[PDB]
């Protein structure tokens, strides 16, 4: 019945959580911000078995509870760490070479400041104030206006614009690449028909000079998709060598057009077409193709979607249908139980 549902809450929250709590710490020891998550989640998960929250069917926990101190600590840590991660990602997207410039002991001080930032509203709110601890809706003096504003409005707004600018900057980078390649593609195609309709060496040399200049420029520019790999990666060397032969075919076609004969220049330019479409065009056909490489978006989305409903029933009642009590622990326990699987899923 009610006791059975409450009894299994502590076992599900602790045993599942503590299994990944030590594992996350061990894995991190063997991602400075994630080290805080493995640490912060472990503190209020270790003290959860002390009071299994099953003393409601023992009149215990007179000067202790999992609610006030531990949930305030957890919410503050999660919000501060999510804001820090979002700000770091936004800075990295928006040229972090000025804000940080790879200056991540400086990040250790900020990492340890999450508890310091937590120790201004989470632990500082250590008081009963008619909380659970074993008229309105708990709003006589504990209306949690600050808890809702800092817990929800501060974290959601900071995170929401942070990835919005991250995806916006990513689109502008990619956009600045497809247009340049398309421009270089357009001049290669446009100048090729003039050569195929050439009448004298006066123009077939001029057309090739423009096409050589475009190929050299396009080689420096990164491809639209299949990008972000290391410059010395075989695929990047495979792409770069694809233009070291295209220009080589330009030099051979232009050198034979410098002597004076032009009937041969089209044939050399023609054989440039058959190799430019078979390999270069196929490369860009699969190119011009979103989500971060990690599960940081997943953990942030899950937390804000499970703890916002926790505070939704906090002030929902106004001065009956009080179903937010049994689901109170379950909603938060799921997030703690979702912490190690998300970390495992991120590692894959």
């Amino acid at each position: 019945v009610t006791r059975i549902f409450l009894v299994v809450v502590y076992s599900i929250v602790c045993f599942l959580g503590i299994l990944g709590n030590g594992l996350v710490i061990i894995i991190a020891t063997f991602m400075v911000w994630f080290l805080n998550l493995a640490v912060a989640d472990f503190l209020f998960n270790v003290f959860l078995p002390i009071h299994i929250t099953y003393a409601a069917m023992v009149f215990g926990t007179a000067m202790c509870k999992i609610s006030n101190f531990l949930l305030i600590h957890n919410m503050f840590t999660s919000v501060f760490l999510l804001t820090i991660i979002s700000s770091d990602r936004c800075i990295s997207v928006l040229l972090p070479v000025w804000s940080q410039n790879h200056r991540s002991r400086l990040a250790y001080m900020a990492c340890m400041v999450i508890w310091v930032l937590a120790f201004f509203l989470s632990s500082p709110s250590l008081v009963f104030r008619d909380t659970a601890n074993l008229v309105g809706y708990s709003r006589h003096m504990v209306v949690t206006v600050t808890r809702f504003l800092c817990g929800f409005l501060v974290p959601v707004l900071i995170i929401t614009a942070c990835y919005l600018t991250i995806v916006c900057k990513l689109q502008r980078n990619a956009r600045r690449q497809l247009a340049d390649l398309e421009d270089n593609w357009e001049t290669l195609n446009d100048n090729l028909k003039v050569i195929e309709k050439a009448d004298n060496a006066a123009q077939v040399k001029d057309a090739l000079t423009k096409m050589r200049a475009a190929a050299l420029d396009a080689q420096k520019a990164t491809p639209p998709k299949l990008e972000d790999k290391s410059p010395d990666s075989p695929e990047m060397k495979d792409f770069r060598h694809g233009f070291d032969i295209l220009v080589g075919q330009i030099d051979d076609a232009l050198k034979l057009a410098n002597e004076g004969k032009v009937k041969e220049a089209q044939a050399a330019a023609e054989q440039l077409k058959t190799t430019r479409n078979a390999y270069i065009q196929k490369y860009l056909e699969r190119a011009r193709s979103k989500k971060p490489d990690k599960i940081i978006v997943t953990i942030i989305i899950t937390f804000f979607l499970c703890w916002c409903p926790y505070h939704t029933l906090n002030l929902l009642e106004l001065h009956v249908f009080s179903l937010g009590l049994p689901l109170a622990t379950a909603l938060a326990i799921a997030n703690s139980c979702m912490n190690p699987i998300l970390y495992v899923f991120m590692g894959q």
Partner: antibody
Amino acid sequence: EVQLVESGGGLVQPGGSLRLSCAASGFNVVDFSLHWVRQAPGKGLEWVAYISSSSGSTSYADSVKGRFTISADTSKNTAYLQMNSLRAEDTAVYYCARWGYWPGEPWWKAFDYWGQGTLVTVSS
Amino acid sequence: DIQMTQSPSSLSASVGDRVTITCRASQSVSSAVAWYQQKPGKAPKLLIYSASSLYSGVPSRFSGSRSGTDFTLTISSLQPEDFATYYCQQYLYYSLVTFGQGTKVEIKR
């Protein structure tokens, strides 16, 4: 090391012939092309002609096309520049430059190991 | 076949000053220009190649940028030894090399 030597520069009657020998020890003429750049006294540098002894693709400047006749011999590591029907406006200091081969780094480096350059003057 | 221009053809900077020299290529030319420093009565020496790199052996004070079809060379400091004529040269093919008019640097007084 790379070292270029020129010779054959001196007084020339207008309409005469001259021969400048771009001796280049160190590297090999086969490895790198040899461009001839001339600088009229009191003016900027001007390109004249180039030779690539690996295959042979001589192509002179527009103003000196046909009159000059550039050549290169790997057996002597030289790049001669035959002068024909020399005029009074061709007086300058003729440098002998070097240049790499596509692809790779050597092409992207422009004329780097210039020779000393021997002046040629034309007067009546 | 292309025309290469340098508006600042006579500079009167002093010791320790910074000199910016602009170079504009008429046709579409990729990052394929170079800058030579010709001391009087001597052969020119390469300073900057590919419009961004630095030659092996040049002092770090010489740097260049591209910023579009134009090109620029910036000198951080002007030592007394560094006072000569600087030429802007492009190179797209072997037969399409065109040199700039030339920038001369003198002593301010």
